[PDB]
Ligand binder design. Structure first.
Ligand SMILES: NC(=O)c1sc(Nc2ccc(S(N)(=O)=O)cc2)nc1N
Length: 277
């Protein structure tokens, strides 16, 4: 792209590299993703018409010389950087609530249009100075496993919208405690960290779990811990919501739409964050 003057590399995912760039003609600043099929582009072309206030806007899709570039509206900072910047004091609850609420709206929208994110993590949740937060880097049909739903880790071949609720629940907990909920460093360690905290799933809480591709009758049997210890600073409404976002059975896991009606959001507002850019 000679049409842009890459200002700096701002990120890197499994789908490619993203740069902060300036359109040397219009002068606009954007996020340019260099990716590297028709089912792909056709799939992407859907994403362009996927416009919502809590979804990073995909501006242009460019296919040239064996290269695929995606131009996105540029957002100020990602949630991982913001959480780190807020580690000494923690993000204030009203702001945590606002962000969670907006992200659920974004997911509710995606899911109603049959689009799944599949790889939600603090690094692809972007925020601006006006208090908004948006979903970025939608995943298409050293990697972080911390936000991966248990059914994915157990070999499910068909993801459901529930995997996004799980990831968001993990992010919610992390914003509240200032510590990753399940910081695994391998698929099995990830799986076992979830088990040690939520209890090893069985047929009672998760019908069908013992018949999953990577399930092993030999998994250790850990008892479930209390949420009071898992996310202590969270009030009971928040813990109630989190528990529903972290149900083992994808079918019992709360939907984005239902989560939006949870009492936790009765007093939701939209604070502005203190961003250091
Ligand atoms: N991937 C995307 O679509 C992106 S990434 C992005 N900007 C951005 C700005 C600052 C930071 S950081 N690490 O907090 O300084 C991270 C990301 N905007 C879009 N649309």
């Amino acid at each position: 792209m000679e049409n842009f003057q890459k200002v700096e590399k701002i990120g890197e995912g499994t789908y490619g590299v993203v740069y902060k760039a300036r359109n040397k003609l219009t002068g606009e600043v954007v996020a340019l993703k260099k990716i590297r099929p028709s089912t792909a582009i056709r799939e992407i072309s859907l994403l362009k018409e996927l416009n919502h206030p809590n979804i990073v806007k995909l501006l242009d899709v460019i296919h040239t010389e064996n290269k695929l570039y995606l131009v996105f509206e540029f957002l100020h900072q990602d949630l991982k950087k913001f959480m780190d910047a807020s580690a000494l004091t923690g993000i204030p609850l009203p702001l945590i609530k606002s962000y969670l609420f907006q992200l659920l709206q974004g997911l509710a929208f995606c899911h109603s249009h049959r689009v799944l994110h599949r790889d939600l993590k603090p690094q692809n949740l972007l925020i601006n100075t006006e208090g908004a937060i948006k979903l970025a880097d939608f995943g298409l049909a050293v990697v972080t496993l911390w936000y991966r739903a248990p059914e994915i880790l157990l070999g499910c071949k068909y993801y459901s919208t529930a995997v996004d609720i799980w990831s968001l629940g993990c992010i919610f907990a992390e914003m509240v405690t200032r510590r990753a909920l399940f910081p695994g460093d391998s698929e099995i360690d990830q799986l076992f960290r979830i088990f040690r905290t939520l209890g090893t799933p069985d047929e009672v809480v998760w019908p069908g779990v013992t018949s999953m591709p990577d399930y092993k009758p030999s998994f250790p049997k850990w008892a479930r811990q209390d949420f009071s210890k898992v996310v202590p600073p969270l009030d009971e409404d928040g813990r109630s919501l989190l528990s529903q976002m972290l149900h083992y059975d994808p079918n019992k896991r709360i939907s984005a739409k239902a989560a939006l009606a949870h009492p936790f959001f009765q007093d939701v507002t939209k604070p502005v964050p203190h961003l250091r850019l």
